[PDB]
Amino acid sequence: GSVQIVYKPVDLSKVTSKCGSLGNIHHKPGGGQMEVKSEKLDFKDRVQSKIGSLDNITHVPGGGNKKIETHKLTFRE
């Protein structure tokens, strides 16, 4: 009972951008008020929590292109 597996993916992709002039970008947030009351806080096994955040981001990638590629081969008898 012979088994023969061949996994030959080809990818010639191009995630491309072109942008002549990126700019003149103003991010002027006007402040705020945050209150959080808790008694107890238990966490376990790969928890990702934020509690009480006042957070400003300005993110101007000239490019900002992303490619995510997952090859997963699994074999069981």
Author numbering: 304 to 380
Study text:
V337 lies inside the ordered core of the Alzheimer fold, whereas R406 lies outside it.
PHFs from the cases with substitution V337M were nearly identical to those of PHFs assembled from wild-type tau in AD. Using MS, we found both wild-type and mutant tau in the core of filaments extracted from the frontal cortex of three individuals with substitution V337M, indicating that the Alzheimer tau fold can accommodate V337 and M337. Small variations among the observed structures of filaments with the V337M substitution revealed the presence of an adaptable region around the mutation site that explains the accommodation of the mutant methionine without disruption of the overall fold.
